[PDB]
Amino acid sequence: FPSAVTIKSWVDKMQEDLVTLAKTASGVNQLVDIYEKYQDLYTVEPNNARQLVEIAARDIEKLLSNRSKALVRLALEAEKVQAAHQWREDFASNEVVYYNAKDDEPGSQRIKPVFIEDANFGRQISYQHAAVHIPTDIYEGSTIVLNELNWTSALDEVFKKNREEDPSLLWQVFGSATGLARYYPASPWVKIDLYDVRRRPWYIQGAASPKDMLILVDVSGSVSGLTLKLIRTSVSEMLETLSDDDFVNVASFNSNAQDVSCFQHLVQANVRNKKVLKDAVNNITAKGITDYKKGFSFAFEQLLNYNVSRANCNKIIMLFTDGGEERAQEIFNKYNKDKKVRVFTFSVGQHNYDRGPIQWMACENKGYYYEIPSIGAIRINTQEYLDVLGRPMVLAGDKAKQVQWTNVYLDALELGLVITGTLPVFNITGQFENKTNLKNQLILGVMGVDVSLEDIKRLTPRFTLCPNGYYFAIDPNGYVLLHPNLQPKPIGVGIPTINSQEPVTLDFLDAELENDIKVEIRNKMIDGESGEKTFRTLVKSQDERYIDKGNRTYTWTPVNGTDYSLALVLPTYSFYYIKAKLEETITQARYSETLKPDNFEESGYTFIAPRDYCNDLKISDNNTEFLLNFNEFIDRKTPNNPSCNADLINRVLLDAGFTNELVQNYWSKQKNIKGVKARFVVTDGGITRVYPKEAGENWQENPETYEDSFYKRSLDNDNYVFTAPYFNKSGPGAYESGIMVSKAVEIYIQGKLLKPAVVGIKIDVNSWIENFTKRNSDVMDCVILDDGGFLLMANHDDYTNQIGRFFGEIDPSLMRHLVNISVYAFNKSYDYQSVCEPGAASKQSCITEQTQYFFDNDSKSFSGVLDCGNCSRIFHGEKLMNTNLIFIMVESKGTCPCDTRLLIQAEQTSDGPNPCDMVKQPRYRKGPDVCFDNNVLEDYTDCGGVSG
Numbered sequence: 030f031p032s033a034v035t036i037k038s039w040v041d042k043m044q045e046d047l048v049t050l051a052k053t054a055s056g057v058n059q060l061v062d063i064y065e066k067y068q069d070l071y072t073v074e075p076n077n078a079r080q081l082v083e084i085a086a087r088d089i090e091k092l093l094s095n096r097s098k099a100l101v102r103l104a105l106e107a108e109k110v111q112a113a114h115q116w117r118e119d120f121a122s123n124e125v126v127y128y129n130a131k132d133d134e135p136g137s138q139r140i141k142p143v144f145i146e147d148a149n150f151g152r153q154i155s156y157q158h159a160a161v162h163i164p165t166d167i168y169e170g171s172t173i174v175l176n177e178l179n180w181t182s183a184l185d186e187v188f189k190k191n192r193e194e195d196p197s198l199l200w201q202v203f204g205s206a207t208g209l210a211r212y213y214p215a216s217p218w219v220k221i222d223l224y225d226v227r228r229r230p231w232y233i234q235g236a237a238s239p240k241d242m243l244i245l246v247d248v249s250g251s252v253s254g255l256t257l258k259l260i261r262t263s264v265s266e267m268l269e270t271l272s273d274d275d276f277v278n279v280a281s282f283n284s285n286a287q288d289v290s291c292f293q294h295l296v297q298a299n300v301r302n303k304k305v306l307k308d309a310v311n312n313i314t315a316k317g318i319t320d321y322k323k324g325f326s327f328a329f330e331q332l333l334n335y336n337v338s339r340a341n342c343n344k345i346i347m348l349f350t351d352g353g354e355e356r357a358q359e360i361f362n363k364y365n366k367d368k369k370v371r372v373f374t375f376s377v378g379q380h381n382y383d384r385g386p387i388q389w390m391a392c393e394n395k396g397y398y399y400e401i402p403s404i405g406a407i408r409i410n411t412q413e414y415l416d417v418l419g420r421p422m423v424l425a426g427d428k429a430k431q432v433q434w435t436n437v438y439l440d441a442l443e444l445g446l447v448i449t450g451t452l453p454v455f456n457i458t459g460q461f462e463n464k465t466n467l468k469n470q471l472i473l474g475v476m477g478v479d480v481s482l483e484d485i486k487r488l489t490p491r492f493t494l495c496p497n498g499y500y501f502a503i504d505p506n507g508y509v510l511l512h513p514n515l516q517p518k519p520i521g522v523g524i525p526t527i528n529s530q531e532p533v534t535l536d537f538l539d540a541e542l543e544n545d546i547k548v549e550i551r552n553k554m555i556d557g558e559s560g561e562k563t564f565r566t567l568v569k570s571q572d573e574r575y576i577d578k579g580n581r582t583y584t585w586t587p588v589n590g591t592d593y594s595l596a597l598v599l600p601t602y603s604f605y606y607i608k609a610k611l612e613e614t615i616t617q618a619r620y621s622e623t624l625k626p627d628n629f630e631e632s633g634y635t636f637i638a639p640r641d642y643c644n645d646l647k648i649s650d651n652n653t654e655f656l657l658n659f660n661e662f663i664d665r666k667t668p669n670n671p672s673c674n675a676d677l678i679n680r681v682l683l684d685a686g687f688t689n690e691l692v693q694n695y696w697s698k699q700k701n702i703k704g705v706k707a708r709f710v711v712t713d714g715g716i717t718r719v720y721p722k723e724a725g726e727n728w729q730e731n732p733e734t735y736e737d738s739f740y741k742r743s744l745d746n747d748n749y750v751f752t753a754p755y756f757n758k759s760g761p762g763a764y765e766s767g768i769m770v771s772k773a774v775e776i777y778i779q780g781k782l783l784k785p786a787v788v789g790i791k792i793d794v795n796s797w798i799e800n801f802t803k804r805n806s807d808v809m810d811c812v813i814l815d816d817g818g819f820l821l822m823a824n825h826d827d828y829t830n831q832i833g834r835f836f837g838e839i840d841p842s843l844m845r846h847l848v849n850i851s852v853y854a855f856n857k858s859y860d861y862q863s864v865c866e867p868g869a870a871s872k873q874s875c876i877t878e879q880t881q882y883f884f885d886n887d888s889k890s891f892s893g894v895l896d897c898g899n900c901s902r903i904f905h906g907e908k909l910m911n912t913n914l915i916f917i918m919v920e921s922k923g924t925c926p927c928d929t930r931l932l933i934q935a936e937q938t939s940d941g942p943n944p945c946d947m948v949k950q951p952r953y954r955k956g957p958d959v960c961f962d963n964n965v966l967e968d969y970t971d972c973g974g975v976s977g
């Protein structure tokens with residue numbers, strides 16, 4: 030091949046022939062003057078990070094404090110009404126009136142509501158009464174249910190007062206310990222219905238304090254058969270009652286005690302850790318001699334570790350067995366002489382073995398005894414231990430009445446991602462005399478109010494910041510409360526197979542790329558500190574195909590109301606923004622005609638961003654429909670805009686004149702420029718003005734400019750960015766659409782560098798290959814590629830048919846050597862909110878690894894020898910300056926008859942990372958500071974064996 034000097038000269042002409050075309054046709058240099066000729070039409074305003082985070086954090090406190098006041102109002106009225114209730118035994122004479130949610134009966138009258146449609150909720154609701162959900166295995170009309178349906182009727186007059194005071198109030202619910210849930214407003218319930226209010230995460234978190242469960246499983250020979258698969262089901266059903274604040278481990282014993290999994294100590298019991306225990310429990314076999322002394326010694330020695338992260342709270346042992354004659358009093362007299370550990374015992378299956386020793390362990394230690402004779406008793410009996418664990422919480426008094434917020438989860442009544450407040454309700458009947466204390470140690474139920482994530486996202490406006498700026502808040506666990514990467518889909522825990530139940534818990538470090546600085550930031554935010562940090566990091570693009578570096582200025586502050594912490598990611602070139610200032614109406618009238626669809630023939634195809642201009646307008650998925658309503662809204666409404674905020678209206682209208690000016694003044698001068706398929710401009714305001722109206726059919730970008738991959742990618746780079754096309758019918762037209770070449774504009778007003786908009790062209794392939802010719806050879810092939818290894822041209826004209834495909838998919842030998850020569854670095858990450866086709870053993874959820882490639886260093890010239898084996902291939906690569914393109918000079922593939930394994934850049938389904946070694950060095954976290962257990966006044970004289 031020609032020497033380096035010849036290649037550099039040859040590629041310099043290509044650089045000078047491609048940059049010039051994009052520089053001139055698009056008009057980036059001439060758009061700055063437009064933004065600099067009309068300075069007095071706007072003004073620049075600062076974006077100070079410190080106030081922005083603290084303003085939003087204070088607003089989040091108020092929103093989370095309004096619902097706290099609504100919770101204490103409901104808990105107070107529920108307590109004082111239950112005391113006044115007089116227990117009855119007949120209801121035929123006095124029929125209770127209520128609306129049953131699950132319907133299309135003597136002893137209880139039903140209601141027929143109006144069910145008008147309403148916003149906020151996505152269903153038909155009725156603000157006149159509260160609906161009741163009764164589980165399908167709980168019989169309405171019983172004395173327990175009917176009595177609960179009576180005294181839980183004064184709650185409706187408190188439900189309306191909360192809604193009238195806070196019109197933005199979402200579901201207010203009362204989860205009763207009987208089993209029925211009463212929620213407001215009334216709506217019909219959402220195959221077979223298996224919903225139980227007592228098993229929901231918001232109910233379990235308010236019914237007891239965090240725990241340190243440790244399951245003991247009897248895997249001796251006597252449990253083989255039916256009673257072994259009941260034990261396996263019961264243990265799995267018990268693990269569903271553990272949140273991320275609880276730490277669990279599963280062990281087994283048959284003349285020898287050992288763990289069922291790879292953990293060997295208490296683990297955080299998140300979604301991934303619980304799936305490992307569920308997989309290991311299903312693979313146990315029943316054989317050997319039972320030995321309770323060695324099984325319990327192992328359990329007691331695992332609850333006394335204190336070397337790892339724990340909950341430092343309720344320490345319980347759940348023993349799943351059948352029966353026996355051994356009491357093991359010496360183990361209990363040695364390990365817990367002061368009874369710091371509760372023991373819960375379960376007798377699974379139908380058998381003739383002694384249960385006396387089993388019931389004895391549950392009475393000496395302050396626990397309970399449960400019986401599971403069939404598969405139908407598994408669900409009820411595996412959630413009743415929370416009644417015992419709540420005894421020290423009730424005796425606490427008003428100290429236990431602390432509002433708690435759950436993890437982000439999906440609402441049962443489909444409403445999106447929500448978090449729920451929580452407040453337990455105590456049975457305080459006969460409190461004046463304080464004499465009964467027999468059933469007053471249990472909670473009546475749990476109060477709860479839902480807060481949608483859209484409500485929180487409204488308190489953190491994002492349109493004043495650049496498209497690369499965003500807010501995010503995290504729990505004191507690392508889980509993000511709000512984040513741009515968080516999606517309303519369940520997370521995956523492995524590879525699915527075919528033969529709302531779990532929270533959407535996504536860590537902050539698993540939402541974006543993980544750095545050493547970000548780990549230090551995450552720990553500081555968890556502790557509840559304030560600070561800032563400016564650093565360089567590589568940020569993934571919108572489409573998981575590119576990675577680019579930039580400067581960020583993470584600023585975080587704590588939220589005083591709760592344990593959350595809020596941070597704002599503000600990059601450079603975003604500390605100032607253009608705020609439109611207007612005092613007339615002729616400019617608005619003049620700019621209104623620019624967006625008329627009938628004028629698109631001469632003004633270009635104009636898009637529009639579906640933002641919240643005001644509540645009267647309706648956001649739709651059809652831009653033409655929503656644009657049509659927008660243009661006949663500025664005029665049909667008075668310019669003062671009593672209900673529409675002028676900040677957003679002035680923003681789009683002002684850019685409607687700037688962008689149209691470029692179209693008319695310059696883009697209208699030339700209508701045919703070589704092989705330019707389309708000229709476009711995307712701005713911060715929200716209008717996109719692709720000039721050829723016919724070419725607008727090929728535009729397949731998001732109408733909202735903030736969610737455009739090329740917009741964010743071009744902002745960081747101070748050069749031209751080439752966007753590779755898609756492949757395999759992912760988009761319409763490979764050569765019928767062109768190659769996008771973005772370019773961000775930059776202006777200086779008063780010494781402040783700003784990036785309002787970007788422009789670009791869509792160069793045709795046919796007009797591009799002819800320039801590259803100066804061809805179908807069988808000796809060597811020359812192509813160009815992009816900061817990611819995607820093909821844009823070809824020499825053999827066989828790779829031309831696959832423009833926009835990863836380079837490693839067609840010539841892995843050279844591609845793999847490029848990584849080894851340090852020109853194309855890469856980093857991999859896991860995507861947990863992904864959907865994939867199932868395997869074999871209906872697209873389920875799974876973890877898919879992602880790989881992105883990028884330039885390693887700033888070196889321009891690359892050359893070397895590729896030794897594929899008994900061959901000699903020598904290449905030469907050169908970087909096209911002012912862009913992200915590189916040109917290589919390598920021989921043909923046919924010279925060396927070597928075909929190595931293909932290199933793939935796509936979402937490959939995986940199952941990692943391995944949690945076996947993740948628990949060895951877990952991420953930093955901070956547990957709750959409250960703890961309620963081992964109360965002296967606790968009765969604990971009511972186990973399940975004394976009665977029987």
Ligand SMILES: *[C@@H]1O[C@H](CO)[C@@H](O[C@@H]2O[C@H](CO)[C@@H](O[C@@H]3O[C@H](CO)[C@@H](O[C@@H]4O[C@H](CO)[C@@H](O)[C@H](O)[C@H]4NC(C)=O)[C@H](O)[C@H]3NC(C)=O)[C@H](O)[C@H]2NC(C)=O)[C@H](O)[C@H]1NC(C)=O
Pocket residue numbers: 116117118456458459465466467468469473
């Ligand atoms: C909050 O706590 C209070 C008390 O602290 C609690 O009110 C008490 O409710 C029970 C019912 O569960 C009342 O018991 C009365 O006396 C006996 C005992 O149950 C009942 O007679 C039979 O009992 C058996 C149980 O073994 C039952 O199967 C049978 O159906 C009953 N009836 C028969 C055989 O005909 C009485 O029926 C029952 N009711 C009376 C006498 O009116 C206590 O008297 C209640 N205590 C007080 C002080 O009122 C209340 O339920 C708790 N809150 C909630 C939500 O449960």
Ligand SMILES: *[C@@H]1O[C@H](CO)[C@@H](O[C@@H]2O[C@H](CO)[C@@H](O[C@@H]3O[C@H](CO)[C@@H](O)[C@H](O)[C@H]3NC(C)=O)[C@H](O)[C@H]2NC(C)=O)[C@H](O)[C@H]1NC(C)=O
Pocket residue numbers: 110114123125179180181182183
């Ligand atoms: C448990 O079951 C019953 C279902 O409605 C309710 O009992 C009814 O309570 C009403 C209000 O207390 C009574 O109406 C008034 O009662 C007062 C008694 O102090 C008197 O003025 C009159 O009896 C009556 N007033 C009128 C008719 O103008 C009902 O009489 C009474 N029904 C029966 C059969 O006793 C309970 O309210 C209900 N509990 C809850 C919490 O809703």
Ligand SMILES: *[C@@H]1O[C@H](CO)[C@@H](O[C@@H]2O[C@H](CO)[C@@H](O)[C@H](O)[C@H]2NC(C)=O)[C@H](O)[C@H]1NC(C)=O
Pocket residue numbers: 082083084086087586587588589
């Ligand atoms: C959360 O509360 C803390 C105090 O508990 C607030 O800290 C204040 O910070 C300002 C700015 O330096 C000081 O002038 C105040 O004196 C501080 N408060 C106190 C009580 O000393 C913090 O601002 C609060 N966070 C938000 C977002 O409002």
Ligand SMILES: *[C@@H]1O[C@H](CO)[C@@H](O[C@@H]2O[C@H](CO)[C@@H](O)[C@H](O)[C@H]2NC(C)=O)[C@H](O)[C@H]1NC(C)=O
Pocket residue numbers: 335336
């Ligand atoms: C952590 O676990 C170890 C092992 O169970 C505890 O015991 C120590 O073990 C190491 C290694 O043999 C040595 O330091 C001593 O033999 C043991 N005692 C001490 C005081 O270290 C250990 O106590 C646990 N806790 C800590 C903080 O190490």
Ligand SMILES: *[C@@H]1O[C@H](CO)[C@@H](O[C@@H]2O[C@H](CO)[C@@H](O)[C@H](O)[C@H]2NC(C)=O)[C@H](O)[C@H]1NC(C)=O
Pocket residue numbers: 543544545567854855856
């Ligand atoms: C992203 O990729 C970079 C480059 O491939 C990696 O960071 C490099 O890691 C090696 C090994 O520790 C260091 O010798 C280099 O100095 C690093 N490059 C830097 C810091 O620019 C790593 O895979 C990713 N970078 C992260 C996670 O920060």
Ligand SMILES: *[C@@H]1O[C@H](CO)[C@@H](O)[C@H](O)[C@H]1NC(C)=O
Pocket residue numbers: 088091092095194195
């Ligand atoms: C509710 O919260 C808002 C701020 O989000 C606050 O201004 C208001 O006072 C609170 N209370 C009511 C009744 O609106």
Ligand SMILES: *[C@@H]1O[C@H](CO)[C@@H](O)[C@H](O)[C@H]1NC(C)=O
Pocket residue numbers: 757
């Ligand atoms: C699409 O499937 C694979 C994936 O890229 C590709 O190799 C194949 O050639 C494509 N098939 C068609 C018909 O385009």
Ligand SMILES: [Ca+2]
Pocket residue numbers: 249250251252318319
């Ligand atoms: Ca046995």
